[model samples]
Target chain A: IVYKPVDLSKVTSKCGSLGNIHHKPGGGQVEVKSEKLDFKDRVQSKIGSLDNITHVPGGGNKKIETHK
Target chain B: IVYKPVDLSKVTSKCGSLGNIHHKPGGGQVEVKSEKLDFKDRVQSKIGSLDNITHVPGGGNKKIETHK
Candidate 1:
């Protein structure tokens, strides 16, 4: 929820699943759409709020499924 | 290009055309949709490339008119 860049240097060092990078023109920023929960949490903490969280088109709901 | 926050302090000081603020969950960031050219250019310069320039949805193109 910091609303800033999610320091990916550490991420790249630990994991290889960085996912895809998408660009949003509205505010002109490159977003890293990832499959890792840790990655999401890391990014979210850096920003401040997940209020403006982006979604995967046609995928519906940005929430990740953990299954029971 | 730069991919950062567009120092809006100066903008708010000199003008009153900040436009509307919208949230995007895809990237989890707030976007400022404005009707002023200077505002756009100012923000664009800070970040670098305007490639990701967002549209007004149904407004299309994201380009402003000058009326030659």
Candidate 2:
């Protein structure tokens, strides 16, 4: 893996929900800790990996829950 | 300083130019060496901090020059 310092621009993003925590420059930090799948990456993975190819109407997981 | 692992997709950015050298995950490396503000953050600062506040045009700094 290359260990170069991050250039804030040219930086790209992917959406996923995790029990995630982030640290920004200028000393910014935030964390989301929960059993609830209430994070971006987790949510994204859920959406991406959902049986959308075979999601039955209302039979798929249709619970949009949020936790802090 | 929360040094959590970076989830490649959820990254955000601010713009700036630098005489930069970057290495991406999985062995990608690039560099810029010059007397120019040839990097992202510096460029961003130049534009973001550009004198829409007080502009005298060419006196401020005029040179969209490139060095490689």
Candidate 3:
């Protein structure tokens, strides 16, 4: 989940697993394993933020990389 | 939170742990910590983009289990 206002009061009741609420600070964004449909969308929605979504194949070792 | 275009940016105010901001580029990844000088270090002077932030018990031995 990725959000901007960074509200910690909002708790997610939808993730398959839940963890401590942390913020990206530089801006609001969060990512967690969820129980909600299209789980990833759930996290993003709670934080109330925006960013592109990358679909991960259900199987494999995936690593996130970046380019300037 | 995990990140990957991950830009809901235009904000960040010193992290005691805030969340939201996306990028996990398989190529640019970002993570968020805390207040400057390690108040978890402060969240303002951000790294811009990174990945892998784990949340666990404040005192208990928590685990982040991600495996292929």
TM-score of each: 0.13, 0.12, 0.13
- What residue runs in model 1 are displaced by over 4 Å at the alpha carbon? A1-12, A27-68, B1-68
Candidate 3, B24: how far from true, in Å?
17
Q: Per-residue lDDT of B1-68 in model 1, one digit per residue for the tens?
A: 33333322110112222224453334324333333222212121121212223322211112111211
Q: How would you encode candidate 2's per-residue C-alpha lDDT over B1-68 as one tens digit per residue?
A: 23223222222322232122221212122222223222222222111111111111111211121212
DockQ of 3: 0.03
In terms of lDDT, the poorest run of 10 residues in model 3 chain B is B58-67
Expressed as tens digits, the lDDT of each residue in A1-68 for candidate 2 is 43223322222322232112222212122222233222222111111111111111111112121211
Question: Model 3 reaches what TM-score against the true structure?
Answer: 0.13
The CAPRI-style docking tier of model 1 reads incorrect
Candidate 1 residue-wise lDDT at A26: 40
lDDT of 1 by residue, A1-68 (tens): 23332222110111212224443334334333324222212121232222233332211112111211
Q: Which stretches of candidate 3 lie over 4 Å from their true place?
A: A1-22, A25-68, B1-48, B62-68
Reported per model, the fraction of native interface contacts reproduced equals: 0.03, 0.02, 0.02
Q: Provide the global lDDT of candidate 3 against the true structure.
A: 0.29
Per-residue error at A4 for model 3, in Å? 55
Q: How would you encode candidate 3's per-residue C-alpha lDDT over A1-68 as one tens digit per residue?
A: 64223222211111223233433423344443323222222121222223333322212122232232
